Ligand binder design. Sequence first.
Ligand code: HEM
Ligand code: HEM
Lengths: 362, 362
Amino acid sequence: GSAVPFHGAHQAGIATPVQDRLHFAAFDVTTEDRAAFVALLKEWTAAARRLTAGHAVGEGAYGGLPEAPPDDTGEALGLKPSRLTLTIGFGPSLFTRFGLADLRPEALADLPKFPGDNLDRARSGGDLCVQACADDPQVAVHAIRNLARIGFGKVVVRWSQLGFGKTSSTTPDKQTPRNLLGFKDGTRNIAGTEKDRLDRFVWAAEKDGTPWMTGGSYLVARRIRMHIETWDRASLQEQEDVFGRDKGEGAPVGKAKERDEPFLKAMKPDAHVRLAHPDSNGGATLLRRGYSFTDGTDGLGRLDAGLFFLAYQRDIRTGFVPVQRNLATDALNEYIQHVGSAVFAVPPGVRDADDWWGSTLF
Amino acid sequence: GSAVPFHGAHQAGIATPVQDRLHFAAFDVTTEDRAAFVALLKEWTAAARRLTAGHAVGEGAYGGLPEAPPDDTGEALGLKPSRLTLTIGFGPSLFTRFGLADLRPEALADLPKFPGDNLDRARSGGDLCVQACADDPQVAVHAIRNLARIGFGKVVVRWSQLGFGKTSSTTPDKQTPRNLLGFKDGTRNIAGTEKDRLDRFVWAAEKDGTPWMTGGSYLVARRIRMHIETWDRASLQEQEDVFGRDKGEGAPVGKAKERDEPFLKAMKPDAHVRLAHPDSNGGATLLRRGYSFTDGTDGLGRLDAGLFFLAYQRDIRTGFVPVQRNLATDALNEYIQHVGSAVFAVPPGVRDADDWWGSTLF
Ligand code: HEM
Ligand code: HEM
C-alpha cells in the first residue's frame, strides 16, 4: 500500500520492486507547439506527484464548482498509493518534432527486423510512453486515464497494454513469479539493490554521448503472443528442454535449486537460457520487467495469452539487439510470436519539486 | 481468509465474500454425446476440488513421465488458494443438446431486446459458463485455462472477460468500492449474510417449477461499456444528477451518509437509483456481483472500460428483466452501452466428494 518516492536521479519504475499490475500507454503527439508540449510535460509532472502519493489531481474529485467537470475522475478516491510508479519515455518519432532531430540519442536505435516478426503497426511505436505500475489495477488505470485527459488536444493514446500479473523480478529475495508457460521468469535478472550492475548495464552515462540522457535508460517493449495450444500439447521434457531449467523448481538442468548457477554446456544448444545468457552474448545483460496478459479469446475457441516483454538497458545496441539476434535459433520460437514492438528513451529522474519530466531535453 | 469451501447446498461464488478478481468464461459444447459430456462434468468437478484448495489438477504440474504432457499447466505453482471459487452455469442453448429441451427452466428466460442494445454476438451467449473469482488473477486464469484444456475436444471457449473490484490487501472490507465512473457501487445490494433475502430473491425453490434447479440461481451477465471520455467531460452536477447520489460520499440527494435510505421523490425522475430501486419495480431486487473491466484502448483511442454486470436472481423474469426494462429512460444511458449479454441457469451446489456439477440435471 505504501508510496514509492517520485523524485530521484532516476525515474522510479525501473529498479523499483516489480508491482502486481501494469497499464502501459503509448501516445502520439498532435500539437506542433513546442511551448504547449513543454507545458503539458509540466502539468503531467505535477499530476504524477499527486497520483504517486495517493492524492487526486488538480483541485480534487469533488467539492468544486457544480457546473464544472471535476479535475480528477475520482475512481481512485479512498485508495492507497499502492506503489504506483509512472515512468515516461520518448520514442524515436518524437525527435522529428520541436527541433529535436539532433538530440536523438545514438543509443535509441531502431530495431532490425527479426525472423518471425509479425508486428502490428497499430500496436507498435509511439511518440512517447507512460508505464504505470501499481499493486491495484484501479490505481494504474486511474493514472493513465487522468494523464490522457489532461493531455487532450496535445496527445492521443496510440495503443495501450494492461498486464494482469508480473513475469519479472528486481527482488531476488522474493518468490519468482511464473509466466503463462508455467516457468519461473525473473530468476537471473538485475536486482534493484545491485547498484554496480545498474550503472554498468541499465543507466546511461554522460560519457556515452548524449548528455541529456545521463541517468536515464532505454526501453524495449515487445508484445509476444504465446501458442498455448501447441505448448500445452508438449511433453514435460520438451518444455524443460526449451528453457534449460526444470519446471517445478526452476533450477538449471542437472541442479537442485532455482538460484544455483546455470552450467550452460549441460543445456541443449538451442535452449532459451543458454542463448540468452550474458556469457553467450559478450556479457550483454538486461533488466527484464515484463508482465503477462490475456486479451480475451482468439475467436477460434481458445484463450489468448502472451507476455508483454519490457527490457531496460544502457544502450539498445548492446543490450536487446545482440541478445534477440542470438535467439534466432531459440527452441522457444516454436511457441511464441512477436506481434508488437516499440523503443523509448527513458529520461533521467525528476530531481525535486521544481523539476519536470524531460527538462534535460527541453 | 485463504480458501472458500467448494462443497455445499449452493455453489460458492454467489453468496460468498466477493473476491478481488474475476475471470469469466463462456464455453460452447462441441460434442453431441451425452455420456462424454457427463464424463467431462465429472472430470471438471474433480479438477475444481483441487483448484479451489490450491492444488494442481490431476497428477500435477511436474514430476510425472517426462514424455507426457503435464496434467496441470503449472502457472499457479507456489500460489495460495486466494479464495478461488468456481461457479458453473448452463445457458439456454445447452438444452438443445443431449435431449434436454424439456428440462430447460422457465425461469431461464430469453432476454428481450432492450433500447440501445448493441450486442456483439461473439461476446454473447454460450452453452456454459465458469465464473472464476479469486484475489489473485493468475489463480483465476490458471483455473479457466486448465478447465479449457481438460475439456478440449468437447468444449471450446466462446468468450472470456477479466475483471477487477477492490484490492483487499490495501482496501478495507467495509469500504464500498467505486466503479470507473467514480461513484460508490454496491451500497444497496443483497448481502451474502441475508439468508432470508437470499431465499426470497436469489435461490430457486422446489415449488418454482424446475426441481433440478432447487438451490440454484439464475445469472444475467452484461458487458457494459462506459463512454469514459464523454462522462469525464460532464459537470459534477450532471454526474450526480444521473445517479441521485453525490459523488464524494455517495449519499442519496438530500441525505448525509452513504447508507441513508434514499428519498426517491428528491431525485430526478430518470435518475438511475430511482429507476432501479425495488419500490419502482414492484419489489424486484437483485444480488449484484459485478466487476469492473478495462481491456485496453479501442481503435479510436478511447478507453475500453466499463462494468461487467453480473446479477443473480430466483427468476430472470422477476429480477433483471423488470429492472432493466425500467432503465429505458435512465439518464445513465447517454454514457453506457450494453455490448455483451448472456443468461445462465446456475445449478445447486456439489453436496460432497461423490457429487458432481450438473448431477441433478443429468
Ligand atoms: C514469451 C517469451 C519469453 C518467455 C516465456 C521467456 C522465459 C524465460 C525463462 C523461463 C527464463 C529462465 C528464468 C529467468 O532467469 O528469468 C528466461 C530467462 C531469460 N530470458 Fe526469456 N523469455 C521470453 C522472452 C525473452 C526475450 C525476448 C528475451 C531477450 C530478447 C529474453 C531474455 C532472457 C534473459 C536475458 C534471460 C536470463 C538468462 C540468464 O542470464 O540466465 N527472454 N526467459
Ligand atoms: C455501467 C453501468 C452501471 C453503473 C455505472 C451503475 C451505477 C450504479 C450506482 C452508482 C448505484 C448506486 C449505488 C448502489 O446501490 O450500487 C447503482 C445502484 C443500482 N443499480 Fe446500477 N449501474 C449500472 C448499471 C445497472 C444495471 C444494468 C442494472 C440492472 C439491470 C442496475 C441496477 C442497479 C440497482 C438495482 C441498484 C440499487 C438501487 C437501489 O435499490 O437503491 N445498474 N448503480
